[model samples]
Target: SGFRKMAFPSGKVEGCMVQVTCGTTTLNGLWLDDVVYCPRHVICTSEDMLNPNYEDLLIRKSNHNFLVQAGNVQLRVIGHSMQNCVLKLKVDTANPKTPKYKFVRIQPGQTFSVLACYNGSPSGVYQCAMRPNFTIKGSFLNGSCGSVGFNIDYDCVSFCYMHHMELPTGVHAGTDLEGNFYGPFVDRQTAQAAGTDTTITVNVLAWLYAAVINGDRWFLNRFTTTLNDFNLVAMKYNYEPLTQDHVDILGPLSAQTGIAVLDMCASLKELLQNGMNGRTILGSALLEDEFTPFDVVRQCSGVT
Candidate 1:
């Protein structure tokens, strides 16, 4: 229904033009959706067995157009004993005119998310002609680190879609009161509320870390309520409290340096992104009061 006519040069070329639209706007460009390419490898480790070359990490597809919903293109990482690891997003990767985005530092016991969108506009949807290239690459910030590794997850999806009554995946599809069709969906607010009582409490800690690191007055003033919510999950499972001691350390450390805060944010956001299992790192040497070690934090933050 959203198709447009095209003028082409005289040639023997024969192919199909896939149409894509957002709301009422008909996209001017044609792109094929038959093929989607993701990372061939998902994990990078110091052991070197699973590490992928930088070129292998590019998310590319032939004759593809990346139609991205605003605030939804997410790049997430989950760190396991990772130290001083850095990730970068590069545009036009294969071209000599490549430009680099800011480098993000990652730390152990951390998870983080990076949103790809127009600067200062989180809700502005857009499309990219994926010819030259758009890529993400990573490397260790320092020459050597012990038992370092992390896994990454990338996702991009439309905010709304036409529905199919039957699906093999088994997700429910239904119509809303306004007669708009929808499928199985979970937005951030719904997710946050649903997560509170779950055994995995990393999201709460991640929120708390963000509130503290960003000096968010709203969260800081309402800190008690959030901490109580976090503690409720911990208490139910007999896990350690989100102690003030750790906050005390974070408060001073953030003031003294900026990199540490970034590292902390990266780890927490990655954890939140994956909704990682608490049992693996929570209430143990790996994560329980993990921030208490200033030297380790310092090294992970690239201060050393």
Candidate 2:
């Protein structure tokens, strides 16, 4: 058997592929926003450990395929406590050939990212600091400032940024139409409805794998409703929800045929390859909303 590292919010990489599909407008939304990364060593954006009074700033990372054609990305600081800190931005590009040091200045809580020299490869480490002076100087941002990474996708007209995410641990705990346990997708209704390419897929396991990894909560409630609908649909038809006997049957069939049942669409493969599998919307605080891989599985399978 072949083995691969497990992906986040969690699931096993079956030898067979799960097909994925979607619409055109799916790429229109800004999946990630004002994101920060945490290496388990820093206080992170989620924590309130920073010295809010001083020139405190945050650091973030993002993957960009190309430079934005128009409009500023609009990076700024928030909160009522502001002594008008002097913020300096620095860029380190993926291409070593490019100039190493580029900078921009902003007043504390400036509305727009008045970036003058920031037009470099989008996929690089962008370091922002609260330099006490106009230049990179005394009292820089410290460990308390959270760290975050996001991916930037430009549609030529707009930019979509997504947070870098990890596959969570644990199994999907729920009942699919086949009565499968602990899986992100188990019912046809939830899985099928998730394929609107025009609409970024997230409720589906495959979509969630891409949407958040690189991104819901009021939406999570909708997930529960969908799962319940699956059960009702199954009851209407003679198709039985999964049980131990069915699981036993599947094992033998796959072994004999040397084939695993495919549960996704073709576009899914392309989605992952294009890196479009990551975030697709704005304002969806996936982590804060209590949405994770397990959350999807449990909801889809009618367990959690």
Candidate 3:
């Protein structure tokens, strides 16, 4: 994917490299928790581009550019005979009880490398229950951790498109209060990674923690994102059906909570209905958006 450098010891030890492979699709979508679905139907049952035949395989090679970031550590153990150490990949869904992190073994003084192929995991036979991309994280009780981490850089390109929906015509760039929480679940997070050994307990001084205290909506919106809170619900269920009861419910919720409501959608089928894949509801106050309405149903809703 990519890499960022930290202050490593002059004689740090690690694996010759680390190997990473993405078992799931490149886009962020849980297998059980879905993403874009059919308008007239639902996921799997739908015949739209959002749902494809899981058996029809593609992308035999690694060509997608991915993002690389490492965890942080205090780096107090750099002087020991650190042999091959074990690292992990984590999937945090707010509930730390069910946190998923796969253990990866690395040689001392060795950098890391990974080979990722997008398997149609969590789809068809790939259920969210089976974390093929991250197998080492079977139980929440037994996960590996290491203080030494070499930078990880990989070769992959990112691709995105607006197939059925209208392209975003504009945007805004500034700090907002929403940046305080991680997502709808409102869990807290720290930019610190594995090497950065800071516990979730010390929130009083953390940036993510202070964001909420300062009411930084923009940054909180981006950080507080969890598995539960996402773009589709923040927008309309179906822009064409905005006059529905859900729209009314969202009105008071968004108003009282400072999130946006129905008028936010730019399309009919609120992009992705089931997962955290589509545009989300963070920093609504700081963003200038673009969306073409197909129905007047959402016209009467609030947050337009």
Candidate 4:
């Protein structure tokens, strides 16, 4: 029974080896995207958050050995206004040192998954975070496996200048699936037929308004979607259509494990993580997403 306190959005120290992964770091879609570390932080990227060694902190995991089959990790987020945000997890699968993983947005009342990936090994270091790309918590790897991890490995990357898209948490009741979840998409029939990645876009938020408005203030919040957003969203869908509408509070975010996104991938990190354990963990009931330890969120209250 060993637990440690780490930074959010990327920061954790497990065992003597400390575990660090990816999620909403400054090193999004940039060159030299690698995981780095300091005395206490895991340094995932360097964009909005100012940190030194912004250059020398990129480490690439070209061909590293995975201790386990990966897993669906669980974390608890703690913050306000963030309750309605997403939680994401990225890793240096391409390069252990280099965190080339993109942001995997989680939904409301959800958590990240490691069970799908890594064969649910429950090993390695981990991290977690809330929406707006804020740090929630993280962990370190000591060459051993564990059941839980952190919110965010703060020092995962150096600096890549990745930008975060905005998610409109309008005033409304959450449907089974709340807000606009996004990620890579592939047609279900096509997936069963040929299985290919098709470029498609769906205004999940808009759809939410139509199908499951739940008394939300769609009129007050005018949200926009982007092409890049579509690509990113597709990733979570595994290039398949992430068609679902539900919310569960699993807690935190993890890696490898597969989950569904309804669009707005950039902000659904926490929810995704929570969904790892509990089905449909991304509900607006919390008005926030999952992350780190104690899945608490902070809603801008000004969302009105």
Candidate 5:
């Protein structure tokens, strides 16, 4: 596990808080998907001594913390203190009686840890000192082991490790200019939450309009040519993947495209085999030939 330190920036020395929003990533083969495996939060004075489980498990008497909204809005209150301090963590909920906040408590010694939330949710999970103006001095230890994303679940259709695979969820799967699948499939959304930017998505429509003006009938017509154009635009933005997002994107689209795109994907996979070097492409006639049309879309993407 790797650790990071958080500090009060001199003037803001009253308190220092670090909130790490967890997501699914394959860090060293561990599939930690939006879950902090242990040590609710990591707090340490020195970088070397950042073990969250160092404290005893029964700080609040109860063996475990309760869940709210099914752990989707978890928060960990951790700190360094001279006296046994009460760290209160709270969130905004739909509760009418206490319309302001829903909170939990943990009284820790030198350090503390607890599970904060489940899944990915953004709301009020604030750690505040009830004593008021009391500064919590320490670093919020951020550490992880896994390197790849959680979506590196299987061998072939793993686009999660791709350097530029950021298509948002709910995008209909489609092809790009080089015939690569360029959108996020259902399986990949859980692991890779980064989606296609709005401006770029809008420009995709504009590029399709340009393709229509250029007499390309199939551009944005549906799954096939539309995806091809999407891939072309992505490559123009320097998001060229070593291989296509074939398995996830194309597999789902197989029903929609009559499997013709699947056939083409199979052919391309064979062609791409020799040019690939462990999730990266080596220099080859295949790359040169495949990427030849990138310049065409670069012109339409309005990228100088």
Candidate 6:
């Protein structure tokens, strides 16, 4: 007898049905000339299977363009389907040598997988973690149905200089009278120092003023308490730092003053240092003239 394909209300059938007998009992669900019943298979399309967005697959907590200081910079994944993804790192061949870097994929159990590296040659895989003072780019491919790209510019000049000034680890560059610290120092003592002790405060003030002057919201939001004290410090020196509301208002003014805003911050720091050293006359005249450090800042910044 000819065999006929098994029919089901739902799902596809793998084999034809046939009749069978066992120990005088009759069975009707068996495959053709076989002892077992024909099985039904469910069909699922590729798109229906775990289609996660690239953002969910590759989570980025920090800004794409950010500052890091001598530590691990990682881009973590959801791990469930991340094994299907591949990471490709691009090397900057302009230098070709020096500023060597590595890109690694850390597995669930903390297993290190090297995806790319720079070893005197342009392309290859090597075993190492990222080094500081270099910028690199990377991409995540497959699994997410699309590519996700990111950039890392690793320059710890400010942080390293802060450490060189004998500032303790975990302490920020600036400190208030109440002992509250502001701005992060390097995670550890680095092999290289960007500047000497004399320039440490200059660098710190410049970074803070630049962020405020440029209206860097991310920077502002990160160190709100610290920057508030920075304003307090200016007030202590009888100068005015930009008010929180006036911070965003100063962005356009910064363009008018060019680099002069940064220069004013540096100069203001020197005046505050002299006042701290008990040289009252040095700062009194400027205060009496209504041309204090922050007044100069406002004037030169065109905010006045």
Best by lDDT: 1
Residue 67, candidate 6: how far off, in angstroms?
Answer: 71
Every model: Cα RMSD to truth: 20.7, 22.3, 22.2, 20.0, 19.9, 27.6
For model 4, the superposed segments whose C-alpha errors exceed 4 Å read 1-304
Model 4 TM-score on a 0 to 1 scale: 0.18
lDDT scores of the candidates, listed in order: 0.25, 0.21, 0.19, 0.24, 0.24, 0.24
Model 6, stretches more than 4 Å misplaced? Answer: 1-226, 238-241, 260-263, 275-284, 288-304
lDDT per residue for candidate 1 within 140-215, as digits (tens), equals 1121111011112212211111111222232222122121322232211122111111222332343334334434
Error of 2 at 111 (Å): 28
Q: What would the TM-scores of all predictions be?
A: 0.21, 0.18, 0.16, 0.18, 0.22, 0.17
lDDT tens digits by residue: candidate 6, 124-215:
22211111111111221211111101111232101000001122222112111111122332212333232211112222333344434444
Q: Summarize candidate 4's per-residue lDDT along 1-304 as a digit string, tens digits.
A: 1112222332222211223233322111111222222111123233522433323432331112111112233222121111111111223432233342333334322333221012122333332222222222223222111122223323542221111221122111111111122232111111211123222223222222221223332222223334455446556654323333222221111111122222234333233334434332124332222222122221111111
Top-down TM-score ranking: 5, 1, 4, 2, 6, 3
In order of lDDT, best first, we have 1, 4, 6, 5, 2, 3
After superposition, the stretches of candidate 2 with alpha carbons farther than 4 Å from their true spots are 1-51, 55-87, 90-204, 207-304
How many steric overlaps does candidate 6 have? 1
Best-performing candidate as measured by TM-score: 5
* lDDT at residue 162 of model 5 (Cα atoms): 9
- Tens-place lDDT per residue, model 3, 82-187, is 0111112222212112112222332111122111111111111100110111111111110011111122112211111000111122110100011111111111
User: Candidate 5 — which residues are off by over 4 angstroms?
Assistant: 1-39, 48-54, 57-252, 274-304
Q: Give candidate 3 regions above 4 Å deviation.
A: 1-18, 21-245, 254-304
TM-score of 6: 0.17
Model 1 local distance difference test score: 0.25
Q: Ten-residue segment with the worst summed lDDT in candidate 1?
A: 128-137
